[PDB]
From a paper:
Microbial epoxide hydrolases, cis-epoxysuccinate hydrolases (CESHs), have been utilized for commercial production of enantiomerically pure L(+)- and D(−)-tartaric acids for decades. All these three CESH[L]s exhibit high sequence identity (>60%) with L-2-haloacid dehalogenases, which are members of the haloacid dehalogenase (HAD)-like superfamily. Studies have shown that both RhCESH[L] and KlCESH[L] adopt a two-step catalytic reaction mechanism by 18O-labeling studies.
Residue numbers in the entry:
A (entry chain A), B (entry chain A): 11 to 247
Write the structure that this text describes.
């Protein structure tokens, strides 16, 4: 049925929240309490989503590192009574989004899939960021694709179409994998299969995750290894 | 000194001549003698180089699969008194360029390099072809880049520049690796370091390879593992 799996990376494969919480506390030290920094990180992810939503509607693209940097500067101003950061620290903090750690199932899940399928990233992050995340999150791909290559963010149909034509594969032979329904719904409109990965801690222990019923998408799993099993991939030794 | 190594793939890392000789003999069987098919393969590689040279001068890009297909059709006509192929076999034969095998040093050499450096392909082959070659040649990369992404073939400066800006790395911190001097000279003009890999069998046992003296490029090696040693990469177990 499928020749390749195409992955949403941030959140789907990476625990960005834990990464940015620990990264920020490492840089800022005793000047901020953990509970306060956690709140900023949650608003930071929200600002990122709000900006990409706005740029998608305007059919525009800009550097996602810049999106993260600009939203951090705005949030630092909002939190300025509580703590401060230097310009140098703004850059170091923004780097956290290029140091994401993976969920524990992900490296072995990707390896298991590759016995039968090509695996590729299709991320909204800049190309340089996802290459760096491959090292921090221990991701090995057949190909790395970024919104930067297409001048458009997911869910714009040109991202999925361009991924298909670059890979030389029909959309019906691509399985889109994500912990976000918006991405799967958009891939399905281009012709791709859909696999939803539940990430109940993506927004934290007291966080808010989507509710996806069985049957909405082609697969509904709790880990990448489970998806590999359901696709008939033999287990690793 | 360097953050990433950027690789010429066909020839530099892959024995395309042996691949296409055995691939063609597998498809065509007893209808062609090995010595005759070898001659076609050598002319086929030459036709590919002649066409890319022509397209570079015209500042044009087209599918490299189409370049290989069109040149094969021309050569089949030239050799038509000796043997024939069907349209279906033209496609199967053209597929050989996406099934290239690596030189024996290459998979472990790339793995050794990755302890210290990002490694990426920068190939003139289409994106889909180099993804397929990663499986046949056992190549694992941090990123895959193709002339198709830039609408221009190497040696056009926009390929090296675009690779640098996509990776987020200064050209002076990129080491270009190739068994072809034209590619290294062009990368050097953009600011990259240069590593020449001798491949004395690239054009066959009685084949013609360049003569490169010590000092022309930053490194001059006989294998990727040797390059890794010279870059201070610890050996594999």
């Amino acid at each position: 049925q499928f020749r390749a799996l195409l992955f949403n990376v941030q959140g789907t494969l990476t625990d960005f929240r834990s990464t940015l919480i620990e990264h920020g506390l490492s840089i800022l030290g005793d000047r901020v309490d953990r509970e306060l920094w956690e709140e900023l990180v949650d608003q930071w992810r929200g600002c990122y989503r709000d900006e990409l939503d706005s740029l998608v509607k305007q059919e525009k693209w800009r550097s996602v590192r810049a999106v993260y940097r600009d939203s951090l500067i705005n949030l630092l101003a909002k939190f300025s009574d509580s703590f401060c950061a230097t310009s140098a620290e703004v850059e170091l903090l923004t780097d956290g989004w290029e140091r994401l750690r993976s969920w524990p199932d992900v490296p072995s899940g990707l390896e298991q899939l590759r016995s039968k399928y090509l695996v590729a990233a299709l991320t909204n992050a800049d190309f340089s960021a996802i290459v760096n995340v491959g090292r921090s999150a221990k991701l090995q791909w057949d190909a790395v694709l970024s919104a930067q290559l297409f001048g458009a963010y997911k869910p714009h149909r040109s991202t999925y179409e361009g991924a298909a034509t670059l890979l030389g594969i029909a959309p019906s032979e691509i399985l889109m994998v994500a912990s976000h329904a918006y991405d799967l719904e958009a891939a399905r409109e281009v012709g791709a299969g859909t696999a939803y990965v539940r990430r109940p801690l993506e927004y934290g222990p007291t966080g808010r995750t989507e509710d996806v019923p069985d049957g909405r998408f082609d697969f509904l799993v709790d880990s990448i290894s489970e998806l590999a099993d359901q696709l008939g991939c033999p287990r690793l030794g």
